[PDB]
């Protein structure tokens, strides 16, 4: 059982997206394929754009509402994705039911669980040559109120996700909650940490290609004067893809190409 390490990186300064890839090549005499543990880290900026405080009755901001990461091998090669982390969670929660009489009857149920501002789930495009994750805005507390999310809906106020007050007497550009009250991933940088295991056939080609894609979905949140809110999902997309060449024989890895793509609707 021998282990060879290397690393590779790629940047988009334009999008503020940067990939760090750590490679562990494992040769194990008890197994008939080459093994590669690939750790994907680095940075994905949220693309957050603050509101202009001079907007009067209608204002907006862009925030980082979803991050997508995907790792893939080529349909024509002998490289499969055999395992990866994190996996989808079969979530748990604790329950306490109580029944009481006083000689007057009382019932209660308490549930206890974890709540995260962003949730990680597997891309439904995941398969034997590709794994991907979506890290999506999930349960966001406004102040002590919420949770809200990308599709929260109040029949009157609409989506109150980043709305400071319903009856506030200020400019539109100033009726968003304070920036420090927003979740870290919505306004700052996502630092991915994904793991994938790949197998390569020994009778295969000595070199193969892996393509790694980091992406943000920016949502458009806007408010109008009561006040109401609307959130428009993935109004801007920013995507950075990099392809790397794995040399399975010499355990080297080499950046071959990069590509920046965006979508603005």
């Amino acid at each position: 059982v021998t282990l060879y390490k290397t690393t590779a990186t790629a940047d988009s300064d334009k999008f503020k997206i940067s990939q760090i890839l750590t490679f562990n090549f494992i040769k194990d005499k008890s197994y008939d394929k080459d093994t590669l543990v690939l750790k994907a880290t680095g940075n994905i900026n949220s693309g957050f754009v603050k509101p202009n405080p001079n907007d009067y009755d209608f204002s907006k901001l862009y925030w980082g509402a979803k991050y997508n990461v995907s790792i893939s091998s080529q349909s024509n090669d002998s490289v499969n994705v055999v395992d990866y982390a994190p996996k989808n969670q079969n979530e748990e929660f604790q329950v306490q039911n109580t029944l009481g009489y006083t000689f007057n009857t009382a019932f209660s149920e308490t549930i206890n669980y974890k709540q995260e501002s962003y949730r990680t789930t597997l891309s439904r495009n995941t398969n034997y040559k590709n794994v991907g994750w979506g890290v999506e805005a999930h349960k966001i507390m406004n102040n002590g109120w919420g949770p809200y999310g990308r599709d929260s809906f109040h029949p009157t106020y609409g989506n109150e996700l980043f709305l400071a007050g319903r009856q506030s007497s200020a400019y539109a550009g100033q009726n968003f909650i304070a920036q420090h009250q927003m979740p870290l991933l919505s306004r700052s940088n996502f630092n991915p940490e994904f793991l994938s295991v790949l197998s390569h056939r020994q009778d295969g080609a000595k070199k193969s290609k892996i393509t790694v894609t980091y992406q943000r979905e920016m949502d458009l949140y806007q408010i109008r004067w009561y006040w109401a809110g609307a959130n428009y999902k993935n109004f801007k997309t920013r995507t950075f893809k990099s392809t790397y060449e794995i040399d399975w024989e010499n355990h080297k890895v080499k950046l071959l190409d990069t590509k920046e793509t965006e979508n603005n609707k």
Partner: protein, 257 residues
């Protein structure tokens, strides 16, 4: 298997009130095919907290204090890449308890629980050539509940009017250490170098503060009222430039701010 070559540099700036305690661990891992260097960024940034009488007035005093500490690393060498660093940004996680009850009257309760730090460390920027963190004032435990770092009355005191501006603000025992004394950073970064390309590489390491100013005004039965100037002074930073030799493991300080 693994050989480490250790180096240290310690640089102080009186102008900036900053000491950089830097440790350089060159890593020779036979299983890794590039050169590697771990940089341990420690030292001390003094809060440079200061109190003064505002202009020529007698009823307005001011406290200048570090709202954020800055810590940053960057290299100029195309043969060098950032491959790891700590701390990293993390998703907010909290514990929720929720109860619903019927009394033969219905009751509903929701409670959320979590841990607060006085200052939070966020990754501001990061790429293959550099990383920048900000350590930002966040929340403080006082009598009368937790106070947000963005409350205009934060640190506003009890002694109008002493004439000494120090008395316009809470005493030291009610200041967090990062405000009364300063910050002891502890940050870490790992870089690779393509062997054998450049003989040497430069790293520029930055430590500093962003300052807020809190004005305390005497009012009306007279009390003190707080007004805040946020980001009053930004990137008050001390930068030092270090050059490593990948073959001889010499370190040299090539410059400072």
């Amino acid at each position: 298997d693994i050989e480490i070559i250790k180096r240290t540099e310690d640089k102080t700036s009186n102008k900036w009130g900053v000491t950089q305690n830097i440790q350089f661990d060159f890593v020779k891992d036979k299983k890794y095919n590039k050169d590697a260097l771990i940089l341990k960024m420690q030292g001390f940034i003094s809060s440079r907290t200061t109190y003064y009488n505002y202009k020529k007035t007698n009823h307005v005093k001011a406290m200048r204090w570090p709202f954020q500490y800055n810590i940053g690393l960057k290299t100029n060498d195309k043969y060098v890449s950032l491959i790891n660093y700590l701390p990293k940004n993390k998703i907010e996680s909290t514990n929720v308890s929720q109860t619903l009850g019927y009394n033969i009257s219905f009751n509903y309760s929701k409670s959320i629980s979590y841990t607060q730090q006085n200052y939070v460390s966020e990754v501001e920027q990061q790429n293959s050539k550099s990383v920048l963190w900000g350590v930002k004032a966040n929340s403080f435990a006082t009598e009368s509940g937790q106070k947000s770092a963005f409350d205009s009355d934060l640190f506003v005191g009890y002694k109008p009017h002493s004439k000494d501006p120090r008395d316009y603000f809470v005493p030291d025992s009610e200041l967090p250490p990062l405000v009364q004394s300063g910050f002891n950073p502890s940050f870490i970064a790992t870089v690779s170098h393509e062997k054998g390309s450049s003989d040497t590489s430069e790293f520029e390491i930055t430590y500093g503060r962003n300052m807020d100013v809190t004005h305390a005004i005497k009012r009306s039965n007279s009390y003190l009222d707080g007004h805040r100037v946020h980001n009053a002074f930004v990137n008050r930073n001390y930068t030092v430039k270090y050059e490593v030799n990948w073959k001889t493991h010499e370190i040299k300080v090539k410059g400072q701010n």
